Amino acid sequence: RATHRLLLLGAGESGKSTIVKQMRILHVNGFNGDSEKATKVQDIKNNLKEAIETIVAAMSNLVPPVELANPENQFRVDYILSVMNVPDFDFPPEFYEHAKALWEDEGVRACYERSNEYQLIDCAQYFLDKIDVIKQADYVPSDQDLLRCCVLTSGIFETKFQVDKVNFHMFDVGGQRDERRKWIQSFNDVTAIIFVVASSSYNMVIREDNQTNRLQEALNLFKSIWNNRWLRTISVILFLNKQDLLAEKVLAGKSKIEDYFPEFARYTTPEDATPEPGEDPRVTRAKYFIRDEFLRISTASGDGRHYCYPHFTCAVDTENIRRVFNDCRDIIQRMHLRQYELL
Ligand SMILES: Nc1nc2c(ncn2[C@@H]2O[C@H](COP(=O)(O)OP(=O)(O)O)[C@@H](O)[C@H]2O)c(=O)[nH]1
Ligand SMILES: [Cl-]
Numbered sequence: 001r002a003t004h005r006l007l008l009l010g011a012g013e014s015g016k017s018t019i020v021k022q023m024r025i026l027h028v029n030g031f032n033g034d035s036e037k038a039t040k041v042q043d044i045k046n047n048l049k050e051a052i053e054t055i056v057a058a059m060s061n062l063v064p065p066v067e068l069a070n071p072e073n074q075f076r077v078d079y080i081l082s083v084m085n086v087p088d089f090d091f092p093p094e095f096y097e098h099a100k101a102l103w104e105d106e107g108v109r110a111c112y113e114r115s116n117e118y119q120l121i122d123c124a125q126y127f128l129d130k131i132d133v134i135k136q137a138d139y140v141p142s143d144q145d146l147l148r149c150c151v152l153t154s155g156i157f158e159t160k161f162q163v164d165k166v167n168f169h170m171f172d173v174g175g176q177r178d179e180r181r182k183w184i185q186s187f188n189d190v191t192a193i194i195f196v197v198a199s200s201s202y203n204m205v206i207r208e209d210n211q212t213n214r215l216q217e218a219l220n221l222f223k224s225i226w227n228n229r230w231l232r233t234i235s236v237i238l239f240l241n242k243q244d245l246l247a248e249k250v251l252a253g254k255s256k257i258e259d260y261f262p263e264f265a266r267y268t269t270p271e272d273a274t275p276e277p278g279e280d281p282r283v284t285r286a287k288y289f290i291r292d293e294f295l296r297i298s299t300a301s302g303d304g305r306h307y308c309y310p311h312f313t314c315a316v317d318t319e320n321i322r323r324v325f326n327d328c329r330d331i332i333q334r335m336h337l338r339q340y341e342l343l
């Protein structure tokens with residue numbers, strides 16, 4: 001009975017393309033068949049190789065550098081560096097055995113744990129932990145494997161689908177810095193903006209300059225969107241994404257939010273916080289602090305004729321996104337009448 005046009009906005013690697021993948025799983029045909037699977041098997045292997053070669057290459061460049069725990073692995077390091085830039089790598093059995101032995105080296109792992117000091121795809125641990133699965137000749141990627149796959153294709157990508165007679169036309173708008181000049185061109189008859197944030201990347205810097213904090217970049221972009229003159233009446237659904245990785249990072253206790261956002265040291269969990277069942281209170285405090293950084297922007301200015309709807313999301317978790325998207329569906333249905341509450 002209606003067609004809604006939703007824009008996914010957000011910095012690079014925030015989760016936009018992953019959300020589209022979930023929409024296709026839920027409302028189209030997912031990753032289609034063996035042809036797509038097979039063609040995308042190469043992306044998974046290339047992620048695995050990118051992960052291990054990035055970690056290995058970073059060891060000598062960290063300050064202080066990190067050495068192998070077992071010097072017997074030196075030839076494996078050399079092999080990985082040697083094939084780092086081979087086009088169309090063929091992934092023979094020895095690649096997996098060498099990658100796995102390096103992944104198990106405590107020095108390589110120690111370098112991995114300092115990955116916020118270089119640029120490492122978030123799916124590194126996921127794929128490195130299942131080398132034995134991926135290396136099998138009869139390996140077929142699961143939907144989760146394909147969701148975790150990191151392929152940062154620039155451009156604007158679109159999906160359209162119907163749910164209970166309502167159409168949703170969703171735009172995955174590339175958000176790396178050199179793509180943002182194009183954002184305004186997708187603002188054609190927008191129902192709502194979905195702004196996606198990598199909540200877990202508070203201790204990381206962006207690829208574009210290897211200097212600007214990733215979460216600060218997201219906050220700056222959200223401020224740009226929230227206060228934009230041509231979005232004053234367009235509400236913003238905020239996906240505070242990567243909640244799984246955020247919880248892991250908070251609980252590991254090695255990278256403190258307050259070293260990057262000092263006001264966290266004085267931050268108390270709000271009284272109206274609604275932690276999930278089983279949630280560690282340290283994670284609640286972290287995720288609500290990050291939420292409240294965005295809500296401070298949305299309450300500070302630009303709040304005239306639109307609302308912000310925050311959600312905690314895990315874009316690789318299909319059931320999580322089913323639930324959040326259904327909440328979005330209801331938010332959208334309720335927007336028309338809610339607009340009359342505004343002054
Ligand atoms: N563990 C986890 N990984 C995520 C989440 N969202 C995205 N990822 C991964 O982050 C990486 C980049 O996501 P992507 O959608 O391609 O980024 P974008 O299109 O540039 O916004 C992919 O490897 C995704 O699998 C999340 O909530 N949890
Ligand atoms: Cl982000």
Ligand SMILES: [Mg+2]
Binds near residue numbers: 018153
């Ligand atoms: Mg993308």
